[PDB]
Amino acid sequence: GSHMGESGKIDIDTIMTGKPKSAREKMMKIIEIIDSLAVSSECAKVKDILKEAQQVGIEKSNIEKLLTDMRKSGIIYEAKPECYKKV
């Protein structure tokens, strides 16, 4: 913005150095939807992520294995059935 800060102990560089941009292009998109849905919820319903991510063109098989990778990696968590929140 009018200033910046660190991404944290993880960045974009560490991804794009060993993955195509499609990694960030999806990763960021998923967490954007999760965080946008979570912005006044305990969690984002993956039903809603399934809606909006199929609208950005992500496949439901993608969304569900992506969400799975994310919760299992610690990029997000569940804490409710079918409802996930950006870490």
Swiss-Prot record:
It comes from the Archaea. Homohexamers. Forms a complex with SSB. Presumptive replicative helicase. Has ATPase and DNA helicase activities. The latter preferentially melts 5'-tailed oligonucleotides and is stimulated by the SSB protein (single-stranded DNA binding protein). The active ATPase sites in the MCM ring are formed through the interaction surfaces of two neighboring subunits such that a critical structure of a conserved arginine finger motif is provided in trans relative to the ATP-binding site of the Walker A box of the adjacent subunit. Belongs to the MCM family. This is Minichromosome maintenance protein MCM. It comes from Saccharolobus solfataricus (strain ATCC 35092 / DSM 1617 / JCM 11322 / P2) (Sulfolobus solfataricus). The gene is MCM. The chain holds residues 605 to 686 of 686 of the full protein.
